[PDB]
Design a protein around this ligand. Structure first.
Ligand SMILES: *[C@@H]1O[C@H](CO[C@H]2O[C@@H](C)[C@@H](O)[C@@H](O)[C@@H]2O)[C@@H](O[C@@H]2O[C@H](CO)[C@@H](O)[C@H](O)[C@H]2NC(C)=O)[C@H](O)[C@H]1NC(C)=O
Ligand SMILES: *[C@@H]1O[C@@H](C)[C@@H](O)[C@@H](O[C@@H]2O[C@H](CO)[C@@H](O)[C@H](O)[C@H]2O)[C@@H]1O
Ligand SMILES: *[C@@H]1O[C@@H](C)[C@@H](O)[C@@H](O[C@@H]2O[C@H](CO)[C@@H](O)[C@H](O)[C@H]2O)[C@@H]1O
Ligand SMILES: *[C@@H]1O[C@@H](C)[C@@H](O)[C@@H](O[C@@H]2O[C@H](CO)[C@@H](O)[C@H](O)[C@H]2O)[C@@H]1O
Ligand SMILES: *[C@H]1O[C@H](CO)[C@@H](O)[C@H](O)[C@@H]1O
Ligand SMILES: *[C@H]1O[C@H](CO)[C@@H](O)[C@H](O)[C@@H]1O
Ligand SMILES: *[C@H]1O[C@H](CO)[C@@H](O)[C@H](O)[C@@H]1O
Ligand SMILES: *[C@H]1O[C@H](CO)[C@@H](O)[C@H](O)[C@@H]1O
Ligand SMILES: *[C@H]1O[C@H](CO)[C@@H](O)[C@H](O)[C@@H]1O
Ligand SMILES: *[C@H]1O[C@H](CO)[C@@H](O)[C@H](O)[C@@H]1O
Ligand SMILES: *[C@H]1O[C@H](CO)[C@@H](O)[C@H](O)[C@@H]1O
Ligand SMILES: *[C@H]1O[C@H](CO)[C@@H](O)[C@H](O)[C@@H]1O
Ligand SMILES: *[C@H]1O[C@H](CO)[C@@H](O)[C@H](O)[C@@H]1O
Ligand SMILES: *[C@H]1O[C@H](CO)[C@@H](O)[C@H](O)[C@@H]1O
Ligand SMILES: *[C@H]1O[C@H](CO)[C@@H](O)[C@H](O)[C@@H]1O
Ligand SMILES: *[C@H]1O[C@H](CO)[C@@H](O)[C@H](O)[C@@H]1O
Lengths: 165, 220
C-alpha cells in the first residue's frame, strides 16, 4: 500500500519533516532507516528505525486546581517492522498517572452580613442617588472565595427641594 | 510582446544516494524562445523532480541492549559461598542488536565482571526503613487507581572487607553484595517483611489519544 515518504523524522515532537513524495511502498521508503512515513496525511508519523519507546511527555495539567488531583503522561511506541519492549506493536500508548496538588487550600465563599444603614441622598436638591453597603465577613472567605453578588446597592432618592434658581 | 517558451531539458542528475530512495531533477531554460519587453512569460515549471529507488537497504549501526541480570556469585572449586567471607566473581551480558547491512559493530566490552560476596537466602538482622516515596497511581487508566508507599525491613549487611587483593588477578578489586537475604526484625503492625498502605487517587482523568485530547479540550 503506497504511503507518503518523508526524508527526516523530528524527534521530541513526532512530526514528519521534509517530504520526498508519495506513491511508494512502506518497504521501499524504509530502506533508509533515517526516513519516516505518514499515510493518508491525517497524522501518525512513524520513523523507519526499528521500534523503540519514545520519551515520556510532560505531565498534563492537574485534573483539578483544588486539593489532591491526578495528572497523566504518555509514551508511544515509534518505528516500523518489529516490536517495542513489552511485546508491544508500533502505535500503542502507555500511561503513568500521578497524584498532583497545585495549591493547599481551596476557595470557600462567604456569606453576606446584615445590611448597613441607608446612606443619605447624594444631593440636597432635585434628585440624586442613595447607596447602602455591606461586608463579606459573615463568614469571611478563606483562600480565594468571594461572596455571591455585589457588596453595595444604589437607588434614586428625591429630596423634594428645588435648587437656588 | 514576444512569447517565450521552453528549450530542451538538460541532463537528469544521477541518483544521489547509494541506499534506499533518492531524488533527481532536470533543469531547463527559457533560452531558445525568449520573452521580450515584459509581455507574456514561459508557462510551466523550470524544474521537474522524480524519485529514484535503489533497491538496497541502508546500513544500520547496532546499538547496545541493556545489561542483563548479574549471574550467581560463586567461586571456582568451592560450590555455594553463601553467608561466608568468600569473594567470588559474577558476570553480566549485553547483546549487540540491530546491526544489519554492513553497519558498524557495537563498540565496547560485551561482558562485565566484578567481584562479589553472596548473601543469597542468608538470615540477617534488620531494621525498619522510613516511609518510601508515594508511588504512581496504578492501574493507570484502569478502574480505581491507588497509590502505595511502604516501609520494609532493610538488612544490616555484615562488616566484610570491601577491598580485597585477588591472588589470581594480582589486583586490589572492589567487592559488592548480591542476593536476596531473609531479614529478621520485630513486626510492624502484624507484618515481618513489608508493611504498605494504599490511598486512592482523586479526580482521575480519562485516557485518550494525545492528538484527540488536544482536539477535545480545544473544542470543549
Ligand atoms: C569500589 O571501587 C571502585 C573502583 O575499583 C573497582 O571497581 C569495581 C567495579 C571492579 O571493576 C574492580 O576491578 C575495580 O578495581 C571505586 O571507584 C572510585 O571511586 C572514587 C570515589 O568514589 C573515585 O574518586 C575514583 O575515581 C573511582 N575510580 C577508581 C578507578 O578509583 C568505588 O568508589 C569503590 N566503592 C566503594 C563503596 O568503596
Ligand atoms: C481552579 O482554581 C481554584 C482556585 C478553584 O477556583 C477551582 O474552582 C472550584 O471552586 C469550588 C469552590 O466554589 C470548589 O468546590 C471546586 O473543587 C473547584 O473545582 C478551579 O477549578
Ligand atoms: C444642598 O442644598 C441645595 C438647596 C443646594 O444649595 C445644593 O447646592 C447646589 O448643588 C448643585 C449641584 O449639586 C449646584 O448646581 C448648585 O450650584 C448648588 O447651589 C446643596 O448641596
Ligand atoms: C553508499 O553505499 C551504501 C552501501 C552505504 O554505505 C551508503 O551510506 C549511506 O549514505 C546515505 C546518504 O547518501 C545516508 O543517508 C546514510 O546514513 C548512509 O548509511 C553510501 O552512501
Ligand atoms: C520516561 O521515564 C524515565 C524518565 O522519567 C526514562 O525512562 C525516560 O526518559 C522515559 O521517557
Ligand atoms: C512533570 O514533573 C516535573 C515537574 O513536576 C517535570 O519533569 C515536568 O514538568 C513533568 O511534566
Ligand atoms: C448574600 O446575598 C444573598 C442573600 O441576600 C445570597 O446570595 C447569599 O446568602 C449571600 O451571602
Ligand atoms: C438586607 O436587605 C433585606 C432586608 O431589608 C434582606 O435581604 C436582608 O436582611 C439583608 O441583610
Ligand atoms: C434604609 O431604609 C429603611 C429606613 O428608611 C430601613 O429599612 C433601614 O434603616 C435602611 O437602612
Ligand atoms: C514549456 O513547457 C511545456 C512543454 O514542455 C509547455 O507548457 C510550453 O510549451 C512551455 O513553453
Ligand atoms: C524535456 O522533456 C521531454 C523530453 O524528455 C520533452 O517534453 C522536451 O524535450 C522537454 O524539453
Ligand atoms: C547497563 O548498565 C547501566 C545500568 O545499570 C547503564 O549504563 C545501561 O543501562 C547499561 O545497559
Ligand atoms: C545485578 O545487581 C543488582 C541485583 O543485586 C541489580 O542492580 C541488577 O539486578 C543487576 O543485574
Ligand atoms: C522495626 O525496626 C526497628 C527495630 O529493628 C524499629 O524501628 C521498630 O521496632 C520497627 O518495629
Ligand atoms: C512516615 O510518615 C511520617 C512522614 O509522613 C514520619 O513519621 C516518617 O517519615 C515515616 O517514615
Ligand atoms: C507522598 O505524598 C507527599 C507528596 O505527594 C509527600 O508527603 C511525600 O513525598 C510522600 O512520599
Amino acid at each position: 500500500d503506497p504511503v507518503l515518504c518523508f526524508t527526516q523524522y523530528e524527534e521530541s515532537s513526532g512530526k514528519c519533516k521534509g517530504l520526498l513524495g508519495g506513491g511508494v511502498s512502506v518497504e521501499d521508503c524504509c530502506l533508509n532507516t533515517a526516513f519516516a512515513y505518514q499515510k493518508r496525511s491525517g497524522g501518525l508519523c512513524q520513523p523507519c528505525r526499528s521500534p523503540r519507546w519514545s520519551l515520556w511527555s510532560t505531565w498534563a495539567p492537574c485534573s483539578v486546581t483544588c486539593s489532591e488531583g491526578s495528572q497523566l503522561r504518555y509514551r508511544r511506541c515509534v518505528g516500523w517492522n518489529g516490536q517495542c519492549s513489552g511485546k508491544v506493536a508500533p502505535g500503542t500508548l502507555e500511561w503513568q498517572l500521578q497524584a498532583c496538588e497545585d495549591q493547599q487550600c481551596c476557595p470557600e465563599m462567604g456569606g453576606w452580613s446584615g445590611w448597613g444603614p441607608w446612606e443619605p441622598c447624594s444631593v440636597t436638591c432635585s434628585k440624586g442617588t442613595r447607596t447602602r453597603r455591606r461586608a463579606c465577613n459573615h463568614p469571611a472567605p478563606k483562600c480565594g472565595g468571594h461572596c455571591p453578588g455585589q457588596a453595595q446597592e444604589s437607588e434614586a432618592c428625591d429630596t423634594q427641594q428645588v435648587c437656588p434658581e | 510582446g514576444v512569447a517565450g517558451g521552453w528549450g530542451p531539458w538538460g541532463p537528469v542528475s544521477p541518483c544521489p544516494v547509494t541506499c534506499g530512495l533518492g531524488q533527481t531533477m532536470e533543469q531547463r531554460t527559457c533560452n531558445h524562445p525568449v520573452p521580450q519587453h515584459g509581455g507574456p512569460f514561459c508557462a510551466g515549471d523550470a524544474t521537474r523532480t522524480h524519485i529514484c529507488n535503489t533497491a538496497v537497504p541502508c546500513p544500520v549501526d547496532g546499538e547496545w541492549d541493556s545489561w542483563g541480570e548479574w549471574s550467581p556469585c560463586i567461586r571456582r572449586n568451592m560450590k555455594s559461598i553463601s553467608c561466608q567471607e568468600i569473594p567470588g566473581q559474577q558476570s553480566r551480558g549485553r547483546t549487540c542488536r540491530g546491526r544489519k547491512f554492513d553497519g558498524h559493530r557495537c563498540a565496547g566490552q560485551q561482558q562485565d565482571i566484578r567481584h562479589c560476596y553472596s548473601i543469597q537466602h542468608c538470615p540477617l538482622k534488620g531494621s525498619w526503613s522510613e516511609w518510601s516515596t508515594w508511588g504512581l497511581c496504578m492501574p493507570p487508566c484502569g478502574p480505581n487507581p491507588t497509590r502505595a508507599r511502604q516501609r520494609l525491613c532493610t538488612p544490616l549487611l555484615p562488616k566484610y572487607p570491601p577491598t580485597v587483593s585477588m591472588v589470581e588477578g594480582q589486583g586490589e578489586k572492589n567487592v559488592t553484595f548480591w542476593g536476596r537475604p531473609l531479614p529478621r526484625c520485630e513486626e510492624l503492625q502484624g507484618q515481618k517483611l513489608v508493611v504498605e498502605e494504599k490511598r486512592p487517587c482523586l479526580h482521575v482523568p480519562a485516557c485518550k489519544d494525545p492528538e484527540e485530547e488536544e482536539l477535545e479540550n480545544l473544542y470543549f
